From Swiss-Prot, chain A:
Upper lineage: Eukaryota, Metazoa, Chordata, Craniata, Vertebrata
Family label: Belongs to the complex I subunit 6 family.
Protein name: NADH-ubiquinone oxidoreductase chain 6
Enzyme class: translocase
Quaternary structure and interacting proteins, as annotated: Core subunit of respiratory chain NADH dehydrogenase (Complex I) which is composed of 45 different subunits.
Pfam families: Oxidored_q3 (PF00499)
Organism encoding this protein: Bos taurus
EC number: 7.1.1.2
Curated annotation (Swiss-Prot), chain B:
Transmembrane segments: 1-21
Family: Belongs to the complex I NDUFA1 subunit family.
Compartments it resides in: Mitochondrion inner membrane
Role description: Accessory subunit of the mitochondrial membrane respiratory chain NADH dehydrogenase (Complex I), that is believed not to be involved in catalysis. Complex I functions in the transfer of electrons from NADH to the respiratory chain. The immediate electron acceptor for the enzyme is believed to be ubiquinone.
Originating species: Bos taurus (Bovine)
Protein's name in the database: NADH dehydrogenase [ubiquinone] 1 alpha subcomplex subunit 1
Gene that this polypeptide is encoded by: NDUFA1
UniProtKB keywords: Electron transport, Membrane, Mitochondrion, Mitochondrion inner membrane, Respiratory chain, Transmembrane, Transmembrane helix, Transport
Record's GO cellular component terms: mitochondrial inner membrane; mitochondrion; respiratory chain complex I
Matches recorded under InterPro entries: NADH_Ub_cplx-1_asu_su-1
One family name in Pfam for this protein: MWFE
Self-association state and partner proteins as the record states: Complex I is composed of 45 different subunits.
UniProtKB/Swiss-Prot annotation, chain E:
Name by which UniProt lists this protein: NADH dehydrogenase [ubiquinone] iron-sulfur protein 8, mitochondrial
Taxonomic superkingdom: Eukaryota
Protein purpose: Core subunit of the mitochondrial membrane respiratory chain NADH dehydrogenase (Complex I) which catalyzes electron transfer from NADH through the respiratory chain, using ubiquinone as an electron acceptor. Essential for the catalytic activity and assembly of complex I.
Binding partners and assembly: Core subunit of respiratory chain NADH dehydrogenase (Complex I) which is composed of 45 different subunits. This is a component of the iron-sulfur (IP) fragment of the enzyme. Interacts with RAB5IF.
Protein family membership: Belongs to the complex I 23 kDa subunit family.
Compartments, record wording: Mitochondrion inner membrane
Swiss-Prot record, chain G:
Subunit architecture: Core subunit of respiratory chain NADH dehydrogenase (Complex I) which is composed of 45 different subunits.
Protein name: NADH-ubiquinone oxidoreductase chain 1
Membrane topology designation: Multi-pass membrane protein
Primary role: Core subunit of the mitochondrial membrane respiratory chain NADH dehydrogenase (Complex I) which catalyzes electron transfer from NADH through the respiratory chain, using ubiquinone as an electron acceptor. Essential for the catalytic activity of complex I. Essential for the assembly of complex I.
Membrane-spanning ranges: 2-22, 70-90, 100-120, 146-166, 172-192, 222-242, 253-273, 294-314
One of the GO BP terms on file: mitochondrial respiratory chain complex I assembly
Organism: Bos taurus (Bovine)
Record-listed E.C. numbers: 7.1.1.2
Family: Belongs to the complex I subunit 1 family.
Any one Gene Ontology cellular component term annotated for this protein: respiratory chain complex I
Length: 174, 70, 83, 115, 70, 155, 318
């Protein structure tokens, strides 16, 4: 059962996506996105990406906090909608959950499934690498190379972030 | 007087001492009297896995020295 | 110089925090070029062996490659021990 | 497995304390007791009404700056490179551009809250 | 007669300006405030042990009423 | 023996409640100044476990320290109702007790006990800070005598 | 045995938190020329026990206008995440040895903010909402500077592993070469833990009780325990970062004693500070971080990237 940990997290990942894609109040949509960010961090961690997993969680936690502030200012109503309060929201929520439940039930029944495209269902562990014993984290080595190989990437991202500040100032100065 | 604040500080100090002391002692107990092996990188985990196989009792903290080489 | 010096004494009076920031950032940009120990940073980074040193096939004509690790030939770290 | 167990225990312990808190005490629920608090007088309007954010521009700037730390956090590892000439230049370039971006928003009065 | 409570121009000489920079950067005046509360920590408190000790009163104190006799 | 067990559990919940009385930060007039002096160093109410907390949700005692007017009466009742239970009311000073100097006024409630139930009345105009403390310790002893679990056992 | 190790972590944490409440009341009391608790148990030693029992037999209230599920969830999040922050702390051995322990603590601290936002929003009352949005402002103020301050310190240690900081500081405390960063770190932890003079999300004199104004009894106690747990944890983090204790592998208890004393004194300084200063205005806190610490933090982040390289003193990766 623990061997399916990545699959179980990916099921919760989708459930969080159905949470905010059905579009209740953005307060609850933010909560759905935070759950998916956490389990998504859990998924990437189980493939050897501790830094990537933690970083995406860290980034989305800051992002959804700003979304929370903007929600209370610019996207609120007298009766914010939970999933059960609106027929359209509830229908999308249940439709997504049922589709997910069926894909999970069948892929775990046949150890395989065909939902448009063929997916094996033997447990995600089968594809893992077998032979490693280096004295370093390969993901850390690749990320650190941003500053020696990715000079060009540094320039365009650095410039884009600077222009971003300039641009938002222009856009929001009516 | 001010020294009557110490008893609460002493109680607070004792409580904060226990987690560190307990963790250190539980580690020795569960690793045959030694520090818990630290595996930050795959190489260290590989050696620990080989220790488990080499132990003969499926315990990576059971060491085998020259007595095991014929 | 007077205009800049008068400008310096003004920002010390008004914005000492920003004076320290620019002073600190300046030393970051400048000193690495003036430091004599900067070259060792690359040498130390280069001398750390994360990888196995795969041996070369002795073709019979590489006199500067050691046969044994304790032979004289090859790079040495005596410079590093005295650092 | 140790990490998952530790998390489960922490939140199980917190949940149990909340269960005790709700099922141990004697309750006496009635309308006036559970009405919203506003210093003894009834609230005027819903608390769900829009609450203007006067630091909205700093909040958006936080998103961009929050992402810069994700670019900078790998710096301890990048310092282990043999190509230190490039790494140091690029490392300083990123921080300087962040400082320039802060300076721009500062001089253009972007850090001042709306009145 | 009157006096001004807040009407003083700070000195603009180099030593004074650097004294103020140190105060700003090194929080000297905030550290001084910490010294004052520290001195109070080591003073005997003013609390009395009521009801075993009582606040002082005088013969004129006006309390509960009573009807008297010759 | 259940009688023995419930008796000891009564002592524990009573002891915990009287040892941690949190009055609501709530004062009305001059009597509230003497209440400030009870929190001041000479009497240090906090040394008894008595700690002001502003929110009614986190308060155990309402000290009605001053005159209650007709205009203020609904707000006093509101914040008393918003206190969770158990809750207690200490009436401090003549005004709160029964109207006092303003008893015959058109705008004054003649005693806060017309609006809320009262556990202790502290006399005085104002009661001294020591008099109020005597009233708080009297409330503590009233809580000590409570028999909630012993009565439940015999229901 | 590991389950026993967990219990020997969080039960002591809860006990230390309970008696920190006594110590703060006594320490504040004596700085205010009074005594604080000295009746409930000798020298007030039972005062925390009475308070805890009192709150948990007090009636909890679910407000009529409140969002039920979020209202209950938030205090569980607060305490559960407060305890989680302790598992990677090397004292000297961590319960969970992590590669990116610092990055784990940053992420868990960011997640804990939502226990303030959701409790305040779920209460559905004006003072609670105002308190929650102050937390949004507070996080925006300190989060960027806090991460970059850590980065600068970690460029002398070489890794995100908390145990490496013990090795880094074997010869000398990091406060010597990084006292400017230690100063800015210390203030940031006060803002991070919502402590005076940055106690804005509660802001009693302004918002009655801010975000937790609608919470009573046991649910209120959970927020209180979480806050005091974070105060101790953040000051343990500070002691490890800047006042590293020497670790003798054969006498690990000597480390614990020395490290506990440092953590206690740093915690006392939090109580000391609360007794001494007035409160910031919450826009003035934002300007403090962004217009003062951030310029200085950016400059010092540049300096600590260059300093190892120019002095040829880059730490080992492992
Ligand atoms: C540990 C968990 C801690 C939370 C405990 C929640 C239960 C608290 C008990 C309670 O709600 O009071 C009684 C309450 C009933 O009292 P009530 O006042 O009469 O009714 C309350 C409202 O009707 C209904 O209450 P409401 O206004 O809060 O809305 C209900 C619910 C709305 O629920 C829904 O509409 C559908 C379910 C959505 C949750 C499923 C996932 C959504 C996408 C996110 C993915 C996460 C997956 C997990 O709201 C939520 O969104 C729940 C958020 C849970 C987040 C959990 C973190 C993960 O609940 C019930 O007993 C039913
Ligand atoms: C969880 C269990 C926690 C045990 C708390 C023990 C309470 C100790 C205590 O009651 O203090 C002595 C108290 C002190 O008495 P007191 O509270 O009436 O004293 C009044 C204040 N003085 C003394 C200053 C005038 O002893 C008792 O009154 C008996 C209470 C029994 C509590 C139930 C125990 C079961
Ligand atoms: C940091 C953690 C701290 C946690 C501390 C936990 C508290 C430790 C101290 C426990 C002392 C015993 C609790 C007594 C308080 C009960 C509240 C009260 O006073 O009610 C008065 C009531 C009085 O009721 P009554 O019948 O006399 O009248 C009330 C009704 N009207 C208003 C109409 C008059 O007592 C009871 O009803 C029952 C008393 C039972 C005593 C045994 C307690 C059992 C608790 C289990 C409850 C079942 C749900 C599960 C809850 C979780 C279990 C842990
Ligand atoms: C085959 C089908 C089988 C179906 C089995 C289920 C049948 C359900 C039977 C319904 C019984 C009705 C119970 C009504 C009730 O529980 O309400 C009363 C009580 C609340 O307490 P109350 O009576 O209102 O007054 C004292 C308050 N301190 O209790 C409460 O309401 C509180 C409930 C809290 C939530 C727990 C669920
Ligand atoms: C070889 C070359 C070397 C190059 C590097 C050289 C670097 C050293 C020189 C640079 C200066 C170092 C000192 C930098 C510290 C940070 C300074 C700072 O930011 O504080 C100034 C800040 C400004 O705010 P203000 O005074 O109101 O006015 C500013 C106008 N814009 O004011 C404040 O921040 C006030 C903070 C208010 C809150 C304080 C509450 C707590 C006070 C007690 C804390 C005591 C310190 C404890 C430290 C413990 C650390 C473990
Ligand atoms: C909106 C409601 C919110 C409710 C809050 C509920 C609590 C949420 C708690 C936060 C969730 C994210 C947790 C992520 C843990 C990351 C910690 C970590 O990075 O280390 C864990 C460890 C990796 O080990 P590492 O040292 O990095 O390198 C390998 C050498 N052993 O690797 C492990 O220990 C195994 C971890 C795999 C399982 C992770 C499951 C996380 C998925 C989210 C739950
Ligand atoms: C002016 C007030 C400012 C307010 C801010 C609050 C600042 C308070 C800071 C508290 C920390 C004070 C320093 C802690 C002293 C505790 C001394 C101790 O118990 O341990 C002894 C220690 C020497 O031992 P050690 O740390 O292991 O050596 C370093 C090598 N790693 O240390 C030797 O002495
Ligand atoms: C809040 C909503 C939460 C939604 C979570 C959704 C979870 C998704 C379902 C995951 C269940 C996977 O189920 C997993 O399937 C494999 C099938 O081989 C089982 O693995 C099995 O291996 C061998 C097969 O010969 C058996 O001897 C063994 O008994 C069994 O464990 C796992 O024991 C089971 O845990
Ligand atoms: C130690 C050597 C390195 C020192 C580097 C110092 C750089 C400081 C950059 C400016 C930071 C101060 O921030 C602000 O700058 C403006 C100018 O932009 C100053 O204001 C200045 O404006 C112009 C010059 O530009 C002058 O005519 C004016 O007399 C002067 O006051 C303010 O006093 C200060 O509020
Ligand atoms: C808005 C855009 C702003 C752009 C700002 C760009 C700032 C760049 C400032 C220069 C920083 C680098 O300065 C440069 O650092 C490298 C090390 O990294 C030094 O390089 C020196 O040490 C390294 C090893 O560390 C050796 O490999 C090298 O042979 C030697 O020359 C250079 O002697 C120095 O000149
Ligand atoms: C590379 C990292 C290290 C370098 C530091 C990077 C950050 C540099 C920030 C420079 C800011 C300069 O521009 C800034 O603009 C405002 C105009 O609104 C100036 O002036 C204004 O702000 C200051 C403080 O808020 C007020 O005292 C002044 O009354 C007001 O006019 C600032 O004094 C100046 O500092
Ligand atoms: S009882 Fe006396 S002191 Fe108290 S409020 Fe009335 S007039 Fe003032």
């Amino acid at each position: 059962m623990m061997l399916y940990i990545v699959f179980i997290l990916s099921v919760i990942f989708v459930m969080g996506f159905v949470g905010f894609s059905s579009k209740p109040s953005p307060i609850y949509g933010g909560l759905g996105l935070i759950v998916s960010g956490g389990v998504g961090c859990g998924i990437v961690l189980n493939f050897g990406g501790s830094f990537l997993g933690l970083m995406v969680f860290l980034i989305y936690l800051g992002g959804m906090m700003v979304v929370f502030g903007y929600t209370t200012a610019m996207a609120t109503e007298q009766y914010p909608e939970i999933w059960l309060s609106n027929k359209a929201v509830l229908g999308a929520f249940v439709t997504g959950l049922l589709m997910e439940f069926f894909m999970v039930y069948y892929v775990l029944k046949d150890k395989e499934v065909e939902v448009v495209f063929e997916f094996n269902g033997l447990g995600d562990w089968v594809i893992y690498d077998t032979g490693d014993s280096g004295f370093f984290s390969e993901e850390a080595m690749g990320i650190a190379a941003l500053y020696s190989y990715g000079t060009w990437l540094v320039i365009v991202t650095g410039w884009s972030l600077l222009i971003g500040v300039v641009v938002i100032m222009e856009i929001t100065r009516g | 007087m001010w020294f009557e604040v110490l008893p609460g500080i002493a109680v607070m100090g004792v409580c904060l001492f226990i987690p560190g002391m307990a963790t250190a002692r539980i580690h020795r107990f569960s690793n045959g009297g030694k520090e818990k092996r630290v595996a930050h990188y795959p190489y260290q985990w590989y050696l620990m896995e080989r220790d488990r196989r080499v132990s003969g009792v499926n315990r990576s903290y059971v060491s085998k020295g020259l007595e095991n080489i014929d | 110089a007077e205009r800049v010096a008068a400008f310096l004494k003004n920002v010390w009076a008004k914005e000492p925090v920003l004076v320290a920031s620019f002073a600190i950032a300046g030393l970051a940009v400048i000193l690495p070029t003036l430091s004599p120990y900067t070259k060792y940073s690359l040498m130390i980074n280069r001398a750390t062996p994360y990888n196995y040193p795969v041996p070369l096939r002795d073709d019979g004509n590489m006199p500067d490659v050691p046969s044994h690790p304790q032979d004289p030939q090859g790079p040495s770290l005596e410079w590093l021990k005295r650092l | 497995m140790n990490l998952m167990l530790a998390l489960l225990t922490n939140f199980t312990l917190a949940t149990l304390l909340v269960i005790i808190a709700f099922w141990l005490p004697q309750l006496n629920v009635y309308s006036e007791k559970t009405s919203p608090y506003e210093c003894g007088f009834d609230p005027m309007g819903s608390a769900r009404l829009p609450f203007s954010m006067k630091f909205f521009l700093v909040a958006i700037t936080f998103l961009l700056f929050d992402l810069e730390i994700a670019l900078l956090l790998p710096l301890p590892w990048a310092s282990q490179t043999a190509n230190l000439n490039t790494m140091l230049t690029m490392a300083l370039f990123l921080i300087i551009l962040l400082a320039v971006s802060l300076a721009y928003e500062w001089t253009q009065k972007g850090l001042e809250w709306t009145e | 007669t009157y006096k001004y409570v807040n009407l003083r121009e700070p000195s603009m000489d180099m030593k004074s300006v650097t004294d103020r920079a140190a105060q700003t950067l090194l929080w000297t005046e905030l550290i001084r405030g910490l010294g004052m509360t520290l001195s109070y920590l080591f003073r005997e408190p003013a609390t009395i042990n009521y009801p075993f000790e009582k606040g002082p009163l005088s013969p004129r104190f006006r309390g509960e009423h009573a009807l008297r006799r010759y | 023996r259940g009688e023995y067990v419930v008796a000891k559990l009564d002592d524990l919940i009573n002891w915990a409640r009287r040892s941690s009385l949190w009055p609501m930060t709530f004062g009305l007039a001059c009597c509230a100044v003497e209440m400030m002096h009870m929190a001041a160093p000479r009497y240090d109410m906090d040394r008894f476990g008595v700690v002001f907390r502003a929110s009614p949700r986190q308060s155990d005692v309402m000290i009605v320290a001053g005159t209650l007017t007709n205009k203020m009466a609904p707000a006093l009742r509101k914040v008393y109702d918003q206190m969770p239970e158990p809750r207690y009311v200490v009436s401090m000073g003549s005004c709160a007790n029964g109207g006092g100097y303003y008893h015959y006024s058109y705008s004054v409630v003649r005693g806060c006990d017309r609006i809320v139930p009262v556990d202790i009345y502290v006399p005085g105009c104002p009661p001294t800070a020591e008099a109020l403390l005597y009233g708080i310790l009297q409330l503590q002893k009233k809580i000590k005598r409570e028999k909630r679990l012993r009565i439940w056992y015999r229901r | 045995m590991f389950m026993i190790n967990i219990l020997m972590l969080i039960i002591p944490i809860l006990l230390a938190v309970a008696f920190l409440t006594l110590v703060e009341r006594k320490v504040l009391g004596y700085m205010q020329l009074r005594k604080g608790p000295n009746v409930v148990g000798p020298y007030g030693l039972l005062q925390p026990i009475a308070d805890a029992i009192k709150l948990f037999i007090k009636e909890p209230l679910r407000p009529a206008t409140s969002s039920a599920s979020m209202f209950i969830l938030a205090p569980i999040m607060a305490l559960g995440l407060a305890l989680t922050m302790w598992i990677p702390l090397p004292m000297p051995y961590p319960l969970i040895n992590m590669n990116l322990g610092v990055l784990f603590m940053l992420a868990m601290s960011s997640l804990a903010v939502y226990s303030i936002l959701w409790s305040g929003w779920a209460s559905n009352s004006k003072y609670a909402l105002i308190g929650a949005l102050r937390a949004v402002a507070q996080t925006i103020s300190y989060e960027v500077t806090l991460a970059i301050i850590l980065l600068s310190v970690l460029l002398m240690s070489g890794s995100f592993t908390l145990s490496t900081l013990i090795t880094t500081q074997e010869q000398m405390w990091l406060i010597l070469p990084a006292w400017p960063l230690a100063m800015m770190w210390f203030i940031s932890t006060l803002a991070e833990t919502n402590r005076a003079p940055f106690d804005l999300t509660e802001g009693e004199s302004e918002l009655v009780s801010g975000f937790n104004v609608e919470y009573a009894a046991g649910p209120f106690a959970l927020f209180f325990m979480a806050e005091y747990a974070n105060i101790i944890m953040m000051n343990i983090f500070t002691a490890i970062l800047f006042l590293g204790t020497s670790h003798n592998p054969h006498m690990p208890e000597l480390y614990t004693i020395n490290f506990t004393i440092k953590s206690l004194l740093l915690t006392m300084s939090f109580l000391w500070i609360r007794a001494s200063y007035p409160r910031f205005r919450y826009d003035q806190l934002m300007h403090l971080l962004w217009k003062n610490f951030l310029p200085l933090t950016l400059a010092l982040c540049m300096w600590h990237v260059s300093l190892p390289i120019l002095t040829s003193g880059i730490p080992p990766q492992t």
